[model samples]
Target: MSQITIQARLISFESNRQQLWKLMADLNTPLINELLCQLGQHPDFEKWQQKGKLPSTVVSQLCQPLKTDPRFAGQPSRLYMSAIHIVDYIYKSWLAIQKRLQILLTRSSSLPFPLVFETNEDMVWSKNQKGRLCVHFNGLSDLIFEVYCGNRQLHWFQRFLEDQQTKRKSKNQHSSGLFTLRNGHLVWLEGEGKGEPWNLHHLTLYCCVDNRLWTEEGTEIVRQEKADEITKFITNMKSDTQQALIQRKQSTLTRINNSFERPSQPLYQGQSHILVGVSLGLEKPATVAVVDAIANKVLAYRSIKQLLGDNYELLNRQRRQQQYLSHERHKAASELGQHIDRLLAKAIVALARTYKAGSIVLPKLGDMREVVQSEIQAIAEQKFPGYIEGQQKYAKQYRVNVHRWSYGRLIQSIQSKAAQTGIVIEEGKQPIRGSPHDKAKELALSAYNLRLTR
Candidate 1:
C-alpha cells in the first residue's frame, strides 16, 4: 500500500483555454493570497488550527466577503471555498511543522494550489477512436483536454475507479465517496453549445506529491524523488526525453515511510530500500554484499567471477606503462581493462537487482565528508544505531582486504554501468587500503545512511 503518480500531457487547451489556464493560475493566486492573509491575521488562527477544522459557518463567513467580488468574477465559489479549506489545512501543517523545526521553508511562493475538482463526477476519462478524453465539469471553466495516460497509469486509475464505484452503491466503504478518488482525470462531452476546442500540446507534470503531508513544507521531499520515479518510468531511456533526468549518484533511492500518503498503485516499489555493497578486485572481480539493518549482520553476498579466466589485462597494463609496449597498444589494453570492469560491474548490478535490491553502494574510504567529520558523525548516529560504530571499526581494517581494489581501477567505470541500467548507485574513491566483503557492506551502509540525514 504505497502511492505513486504517473503523469501524461494535458492537451486540447492550446492557446485558447490555456490562456485561462494560466490566467486562472494568476487570478486565483491573488484570491488565495488574500484569503491566506486574512486567515493568518485572524484572531483565532491558532484556535482553529488546534481544532483542525474551520467550521462550515466560519468558512462561509470568511468566504462571503469574496463571494461576489468583481476582480475574481469567473472564479467559482466552490473553487474559492475549496481553496480556503486547502489553505486552512496548509496553515495547520505550517504550525505543526514548526514544532519539528529547522524546516526548509519556501522563500516566496505564489502559484495556485492544485485545482481541487470533485474527482468522482466532475471529471470523466475515456479513450475512444476520437482521442484521449479527459473532460471536466468544474466551477472555473469546463475543459476538454487530452491526457496521454500510459498503460501503467491507466491500470491504477481503473482499479481506483472500481473501488470508488463499489463505495458509492453497496461495498466495504461506509459512505458513498471514493476511498481516495485520486484526483481522478475523467472524461465527458462538452455540451450542445460547443464553443471551441484548442488543444494544448504536451505540458509536463513537473512534480507530484502525497497530498497528505504536502501541505507541510516537506513537499520538496516527496516532490523531488517521487517526481523522478514517475518521470523515469514515463520516458524510455533507450530513446530520450528532455524531462527524463539522468538517474545518477543513487538519486532514485526512495525511503518509503509513513510520513505521507501517496497513490496505492505505484510504478516502482523498491525492496525495502535494500542496497548492495560492492567491492571489486583483480582476482575476485566484484563481491557485492547486503545488510539486514536490524539483524546487524551481512544478510547475503555475491562474488562475480564467471568469465574472468582471461583477466590478465589489468595486470598487463602496469607492465605496459614501463614502455613494455607501444603507446597505441597501451591505450588498447586500457580500454580492454575498462571493458572487463564494465562487464563485472554489470554482473554485480544484475546480481543485486536480481536479489531485489533497488540500488548498489560502492565502498570508498576517502571523501571530504570523512575528512571533516569529527562531530557530524553524531548527526544520524542513532539512525543505524550499532551499524555506524561497526562500520567505523571495519573501515579502519580495510588493509586486511584484497589489495584495496585494483588500486582504484574497479570503480572507474562502475558509475556508467549502473547508469545505463537506469538504477541509482553510488561510486566511492578511497584506497580500500585493502577491503573486505563485510567491510564493503559496512562502508556501503555508512554512505547510504548519510543520505538519510539530508
Candidate 2:
C-alpha cells in the first residue's frame, strides 16, 4: 500500500487566549409562522396546488415583507432573543438536507447494484473444510475481504491480506486468496496458518481502480508530441522549428485537456472477480497457503502478478497494435472509419464482458467521430413527430437555435444507435456552451415518445 502523509502548521496562542469564532445568522423569525399560515390558512392553497397553480414568484413577492421589515431594524432581536438563531438554523438545515438528498439521488442513479436486497442470515453450506476451494467456487478473486466472529464479547473485525508476501525463504510469494462474505465483511479460511498470523474468517475483497493512470497517459502523450516538435526544429537549420513547435505544443496541450486519455487498453489482463475480507484493525496481520484450491494439491505457486505475466504481455501487444492503428487512421482519414468501427465494437464487447455488464455507455461519441445534422433530425422525426413539432417553437428562440453541424450530427448518431440497441438515450436539457437550444427543446418535446429500443 502507498503511504499518504498530511502536514499542517498551526501557530500556538497565549496560555490565557481562547479560539475566536464568527457567526452569520439569518434575520427572519417570528412572522415566519404567520407567513406559512397565510399559505396554509388561505381558502385556496390546496385548491391551487395542481397544474396551472399560482406561481411561487407572485407568492414570494407578496410574502417578502413578512420575513423582512426595514422599519423593525433589529427590534425583534429584543422581543424574541432566539428568533434569529432559530431561523438561521432552520433555513440552513433545510438547504443542507435538500443538497444532501440531491447528491444521494444522483449517486443512486449511477450505482451498479441495487441499494437494498433481501438479507440471507442462515444460508451456511455444509461443504468440504477446504476453504480455498470454497472461495474459488464462489467466484471470489482479486479483492480484500474481512470477517468478524467468536462469542458476543470476543467478536471483532478480522482482516485477510490475501495478496501479501509470507516467509523468509520464499523468493516470490504473494497472497491471492479467494474470499466471500460471512457476516458483513470478507474472509478466507484455508490459508490461515501458512504466513504470519491466522485469524481470517471465510472471505472478503477490495480493489480500487486508479483514475490517475488515464490522466498520466494523456500528459505523457502531449509531452512526447512536444519532444517531437522540438526535434523537428533542431533538425532544420534553414527554417527554425520555434514557431511550428510552439503551435504544435499548444495544440497538443489543448487536446490533452479535452481528451479522456485512457490507455489503448487496460493494464490488468484477465477477468477478475474478487471477494475481500473485512479489516479488524488499521494494520492487520495475514497468513497464506499454497494449496491448489481446485485439485486440493498443496504445491508451491508463483505470486499472482507473476502468474499473470503472460496475460499482461498479450494485453500490451494488443494495446500497441491499437495505438498503431489509431496513428494509421490519422494518416489515412478516408478509409479508416470502417476499420475503426469494427475494432471499437470488438473492444466494447470485450470490456462489457470483463465487468459482467449487460451494456456499456459510450459517452460523447460525436466528439470522437463525425456525424450529420440531417440524420439527427430524421431520427428525431421518426422517434417523436408530435414532440418535434412542439419544439419548433424553441427553434426561433435566440438561445435555442441548434444550427451547428457538429451538434446535429452528434445527437442523430446517439439517438440512432440507442434506438438500434434498445438502450435509453437522452440529450442535454440546455444547449452546450456555443450551440443554441434547438436540440434540447426538440429532445424535451420528443422525450416521452422516444422508446428505449425501437
Candidate 3:
C-alpha cells in the first residue's frame, strides 16, 4: 500500500489594535496589583527585607500570573497585550523612580538609608558597561541606582563573588543577592558571617501606584484624546462595519488545523522520501531546499522572494501608516491595517507549502538570547572599532530589531501544514547563517538522514 499525503495552508488573524490594547490594559492592571501584594508575603519577601530589594528570582516569581493564569493567556491577544503592558509598566516606572532617588540622594547627605517610598509596582535591572550592576525601580524617572562593591565592604564583596562561583559550579544555580539603598548608593550584605544587617530601614509600604497615574500631564491628555476617538469610532461605526469587525475578531481566534486523521489506504507507503528545510529572514523572506539525505546531497535549493516580493516592505509601511492614523485619531485605517497583516500571513503559508516535503525542519526562533548577544558583540566591534562605550547604546538598538522578526509565525504555519499531512516537523538546533533558506535546506537534509539511521 502507498501512503497518501494531503497539505493545506493555514492563516492566522489579529484583531483591531486599539480595542485589543484597551482590553489588555484593563485585564492586566488588577492582576499586576494582585501579584505585587502576593509577592510581599512570600518567604523571599523576608530575604528582600534583609537585602533591601527583590532580585530577578523574585521578579520572575511575581510575573507568574501572565505565564500561568487563564485570564492572561487564554487568548492570543490577551497574552501578547498583557505581556507587553506589564513589561512596559515595570521597566518605565522602575526607571522613573530610579531617577528621582538619584536626584534626592545627590542633593541631601542626611536622606535616610533605604529611603522608603511608595511607587507603582514595577522594577527591572541591567548591567552597565563597567561591570557594575544597575537597578531601576519605583515611580521616579531619571535616577538609576549604580550598584558597586564600595571599599568598606570589599572583603564581603569578594566572598560573595566566591560563593556565587561555588554555587554555579556545584549546583549550577545562580545566586541572587539583595542590596540596600543607602545615602544614594546601593550596598550588599556579607551574608551570615556578620549576622543580620541592621533592619533600621523598615518603611511601611502601601498598595502599588497605578502606572497610568505617573504619566506626564500633557502625555496623559493626548492619550485620553486618542482613547476617546477610539470610543467615538465604535459608536459611529455602521452596522456592516461592526459586523465586519466581529467577523475579523472571530477569525483571529481560530487555531490552525493540526488534526492527524487516519488515511483510508496507505499510498506512498515505505517509499524513500525527500527532506525539506525552510528558513525565514528579513531580506529574502524565506529560503527552501530539498535534500537527498540518504546520499548526503542537496537535490535542489531556492529562495522564496518571488512569492513575497515587496510585500514585506509594504506590510511595514502599512504598519507605520496604521500607527500614524492611530495617533491622529483616524479609525478607517484599522481595516486596511488588519488586511495587510492577513495578506502577509497568507504569503508566508503559501511559501511553506511550495515543496512536497516528507519532513520539514526549521530553526527555533524563540529564546535567541545567545544569538542576539553574539550578534551585538560582533556588530559593536565592527561599527565602533575601538570605542567600547559608544557601542553599547547602538548595540541595544540593533538588538531590538534582532528581536523583531516574524520567524515564529512562519514556523507555526509550517508546523500546522506538516501536522495535517502526517509529515514530521523537526527543529533545527544549529545556528542560522547565510540565507535561512539554505540553512533550512541543510537542516532538513540532516534531519532526514538522521531519521533513516534510527
Candidate 4:
C-alpha cells in the first residue's frame, strides 16, 4: 500500500493540566530511545544484522527485557506493546535499507513519537456522551484523554474505522515530516543535518498508522506529457491514434483477466496489448520503447533527454559538475539527482499509460559493469584488429555505472506510480548485445515474447 500518515494532536482532559502533551512527549522520548538502544547496541542484534537474518523469536525475546526494566515500570503495557511494534518496524525497515545500499548503519532513537493504540477497549473510537465522534485514548498509566483532530481527519479515521481489516494507529503532533511531490511522485523530506549529501533518496520512513488511515495532503500529482518528441513521433501513425495513444491503465486489469479463465472473461483492450519497454544506463539514463505485442513491432522510442527538451547538456554539466570548487556541491547534486529521478520516473509512467501498454518490461535494476567490461574488450578488437588472449592484463579498464542516476530509486518510483496506472513491471534480464536503444527495445520486446511464450 502507498503510505498515509495522520498527525493528530493530544489535548488534556483535566482543566488544570495543560502540560499533558509535553509530558507525553517527555516520557515517549526515553522509552523509544531505550527500545532502539536495546536492539541497536545488542551484540547479537548487530551480529544478526551482519548475518542478514534477524530471528523473529530473538527480536521478541530481546524486547522482553524492556518489560521488567524499572525505568518503564510506570508506562502502560500498551506502551511496551507499542515499543515492540515500533522496534520491529524499524528493524525491518533498517534491514531493507541495509540490503539495498549495503550500508551497516545502526538504528537510532527517533523523534518523540506517540503511543500506539490497539483496537480494543483501550482505544475508544465512536461517539462520546456529547454525540460527536469523539475519540477516547487510554493514555499513560490509567489516564484517559480526548483527541483534537480535524473533521476531515475524523472522517478519514472513521473511514478506516469502518474497515473490518485493520486496527493499528500512530500518534503525532505535527505533519508526518515534510512531503513534496517530485514530478508526479510523492517525495518526502527524509532527514536533517546528517542527511546524505548526494540527495540519495536512500531512506524509508516507517509509520505505525493503520493502512487505511491517511493524513498527508494538498500536494497534487500532474504528469508533464511533453508532446514534443513523443507525440510528434506518434502523429504520423493515425490522427485518432494520437489521442488514443496519448491516453492508457485499465488494460493492466485486462492483462490480468487474460490470465484467468474468466473475470468474468479476459476482456481484450484493443487489437493488441501495447507494451512499453524501459532501458536504463549512465549517459542514456532512461530509454523507453513502445511495442505492439501482437505484431511484435517497435512503435516508437525516445531517450529521457530527448523527451525533457533543452537544458539536457546544462543539466549534465551540473550532473557531472565540477566537484572540488562548487559550493554546496552535494546539495546541488542531490537536488539535481532528485529532480532528474522524478522527471525520469514520471516520463516513463506517463508514456506507458498514454500508449495504453499492458506491461512495462526492462532489465532488473542493477549495475552492468561486467557487461560493459566485455563490451570494451570487444571494442578493442574492432579498433586494433587483434584479439588479446587476456584482455584483463593489457586492455585498460572502463568503469560504468547504473549506480549513478539512482536506477534503484527510479524503479521504486516507477513501480509505485505504475501500480496506480496498472502497468505490469516485468523487470528481468538485459541482453548482452546491441546499442542502448536497440537493447532496450529488445529487452521490452523479448520480455513480452517470453510472457507470450509462457
Candidate 5:
C-alpha cells in the first residue's frame, strides 16, 4: 500500500492530519470516482494528464484541508509520507464517503420495499393501514432500540404487555425502569412501588459463553488434594496443640475459597448492556423518559402527544382532514394514533403491577434473582375495545382501526438514556430470560419447595 507521510509539527489541525486526509482520499476514490462520473467528469488519469491542469474547485473539494487552511495555500508545498497519517486519513475518509453515499442514495429514489403504488392517493390508501401499523411498532422499537441495541433476543410481545400495565398504574405518575439484555434474556428492572415508572423498554444483547474445563473430572483433582491435606492436618493436630485450631481454620478457609474459584464459575467473554423507556399519549402530557443505568444520565424525555414537527406532520395533517380524513387514504394515520394510545395505556398499567415494590438484584455467576412489581394491562377486542374502530364509514375496510403499540417511542427513549449512561446495549433474546416473573406470588405459594434443598 502507498503510504502518505505526515509532517506532524507542520500541520495545524493535528500531527498526522495530512496523512489521515491522504488515507481518506485514497480509500474514497471509488466513491469520489462515482461522484465525478455522475457530475460528467471521467476519473481516468490520462484525461486529467491531457488537460495539463486540474480545476481549483475540484482540487479544493478533494483537498478540503488544504483549501481551508491559509498556511497550506501560501506555504511552499512538499510531498511527504507517514504510516499513521495514511491510516487516519483512510479511516476518516471512509466515514465521510459512506455518509455522502447514504445521502445520495436516499435522494435518488423513493422506492418501497416491494413496489411503489402508482399515485400518491393510491399509495396512501394501499399501504397506509399496514404501513401505519409497522410504523407505529417501528417507532416504539426505535425508542427502545436506542437503549438496548446489542442485547439478546427479546420476547417483544410479552414485554409490551407488561409495559402496558405499568403505564396505566403510573399514568398520572412518571416511573422508569432499568432494562438490559444479557445472555439472551430480557431484564425488567424497577424499584419498589405502585405508581412507579414502568412504561420503559430497554433491550441489549449479551453473548453466551461455554467452557468445558470445569467438569466432574476437574473436581477430582481438587478433591483428592483437599483430602490429602485434610488427612495430614488431622494427623498433625495432636502433635501441635497450639496450632490445632489454626490449622483447621486455615484448611477450611482454603477449601471454601478453592471451591468457589475459577473452574466452577461460568465465564463470559464479550457482551454489551443497554437501557430504554416509553409512555402513552392517551393521558395529558404523556411522558417518555430514558435513562442510562450505568452512566446515570437521561438521554431523552418528551411527551408522547407532543407533535414531533415535520416528522409527525402527517399525523397532524390527517387529524386536520376532519371529514376528509374519513377516506381510506388518511384513515390509517387517524386510527394508528388511537390504537397507539390504547396500547400505551395498557402497557403502563401492566408494567406498574409487574415492577411495583420490586428490588434491584445483581446476579453473581449462575444464581437466580427475584423481582417484585404490580402489573395492569389493556387488551383490545370486540368485548373490550379500548379504541373505537370505525368512526367514519369509509375508514372501516382500511384495517386502520386496529389497536396500536408505541414500541418505537419507548425504544428510542430507552436507547438514548442508555447511551447517556455510557452502558453498552445489546439486542434480541438473551440468556437471562428465565428469571422469576412473579415475586410475592412465587414466594407466597411456597413454590420454593420445588428447590432441591441445596
Candidate 6:
C-alpha cells in the first residue's frame, strides 16, 4: 500500500476570543481611563499613545482594577460609561477577527505532496498483542523527510540536543541521548559517536492538513485592525459624550441577548438501534477495535494514529511554543489539541458508519479506579503475586504517569461525538477480570447479545 504523509502544526484561536471577552467584561471605564492617565507620563504609555493601542505593560496593569481603584466595588455597572463603550466596540471587532481566523485556519489548500489511500484486506491484521490493525505504506516516510529537510529541519535537531544538555546538567546525570522525531518515532545513539548519518527513511510524520502560516499572518492583521477600530471608537466616544452612553446601553443589551440564546441542537435525531463495542488501549492511542454484537463479528476498526502516527512529541512542541507566542498563537496551539481530539471523535463516527451502527458501547473509565485499587488490595494479600510491584516498575520504565491518564476524558470525547451523530452511547460496567480494554469489549457484547434482547 502506498500513502503520503505531511508534517504540519495544528492551531486553535478560540481561547484568545474568550480571553478578549473576559478582559472586556471585567475592566470598566473609570479604571481604564485612570490607569491611562497615570501611565500617560510614562515612556511606555507615550509609545502606546503614538501606536494608538495599549502597550503590554498597560494591558497587564489593567488586570488589577481593584488595586488601581480604591472604590472599584467589583460591579460591572460601576465601570465608567465610556470605558464600557470602548470595550464593547473592541469586543465586536474581536468577534469579526475570530470569524476570519476560523476561515483561514480551516481552509483547505493544495498539499505539498500527493494524497493516496490504500487498504489490503488480506494484509490487514493485528500487529500488536492488543489487537490493533496495522498497515505499512510506501512514499509516506519519504514525503515527510522531503518536507522536513526542505524546511531546514536541522534547527529542530540542534534544539533537541541543547535541551538534552540542559536537562543533564540540571539533573546531574548522563544524557539519555535520544531524540523524538516529529512523527513520534524515537531515535537513539549506540555507544559514544560524534555523529551518525540521518535520513528521513527512519522517521515518520503525522498526516495533517495544515495552513498555520496563513492563519498566523491573518490573526496578526485582524488584531491590528481591531486595535485601530477600538482607537477610532474611543476617539469618537470622547468627542460625543452622550452618544457614548447610548452606545454602551445598546451594547449591553446585545451582549445579554447573545448570552441567552439557546445552543444549537445535535446534528442527528431519532432512535439508534445498531450496537457496536469499542475498546481503547494504551498501546494504541486513538484507535478503537469495534465488534458488532448482532452479527457477532469484528465488523470495523479504525485508528487516527495509524494514519497520522503518534502525536505526543508534536503536541509537546506546540505547548512549548505556546509559552512564547502571542495570545492568539498560543491559543491556536491549545485549540489545535482540541482539534486533534475532534479528529479522533470523527474517526469513531466513521467506524460506526461502516456497520450502520447507530449505538456504541464503551467502557466506563470512571469505575476503573476502584477496580485498580481493588486489584492492588488483592496483590497486597498475595491474591495476584507481583502485580502491584510489577505495575509500579513498568510505569517507571515506560515513563507513564498512570494516575494522570484520564481515561474518562477519552470516554467523554467519544460520548460527545456520538451525541452529535445521534448515536446512542451506553457505558459498560467494569469487568470482573482481564484488562480494561478486553473487559470493555466483553461487557459490551454481553449487554447487546444477552441483556438488550431480553
Highest lDDT scorer: 4
User: Residues 135-168, candidate 5, lDDT per residue (tens digit)?
Assistant: 1111112211212221232233223334333444
Report the Cα lDDT for candidate 1.
Answer: 0.50
Work out the TM-score per prediction.
0.41, 0.18, 0.34, 0.56, 0.20, 0.34
lDDT of candidates 1 onward, in order: 0.50, 0.29, 0.45, 0.52, 0.30, 0.43
lDDT of 5 at 151: 24
Candidate 4 error regions (>4 Å): 1-26, 32-70, 93-110, 113-272, 309-318, 321-333, 372-403
Which digits, one per residue and each the tens of the lDDT, describe model 4 over residues 269-306? Answer: 32236777887664466788887866757888887777
The best candidate by TM-score is 4
- Please give, for residues 1-454, the per-residue lDDT of candidate 3 as tens digits: 1111111111111222233234434564445445555654556544444333334544554565566566655434323333434543454465567555661111222112222221212333444587654444433324454444346443333333343344345443321211111112122222233322232121111111212212233223334554455456656763798788856533322211111111234322112476766655544445666776667677766665455567656655654564565456644444554454345445434444454445666666765545445545765776788887868877766544333344555566555544433456676653444445555666776666667777
Which portions of model 3 show Cα errors greater than 4 Å?
1-272, 281-285, 318-354, 372-403, 432-435
Which should have the higher TM-score, number 4 or number 5?
A: 4
Give the count of colliding residue pairs in each prediction.
13, 40, 17, 0, 108, 2
Model 5 misplacement above 4 A: 1-399, 402-406, 422-454
Is candidate 1 or 4 superior in TM-score? Answer: 4
lDDT of 2: 0.29
Q: Looking at candidate 6, what is the lDDT of residue 121?
A: 16
On residues 1-454, what C-alpha lDDT tens digit does candidate 6 reach at each position? 1122343321113443243233333443345445445544445543432333332334444544454455665433322332433433443454567555661121222111111121111111113244322222232211111213335443343333343444445552321211122122112122233432121112233431212111233223334554466557667765487777757644533332211111233233333445666655433333454665656566555544442446556544534454445444546734554555555666677667655677677766767666655444443434335667666655453332222234566676777777545577776664554544455557667657655655
Worst 10 residues of 4 by lDDT: 177-186
What order do you get sorting by lDDT, best first?
Answer: 4, 1, 3, 6, 5, 2
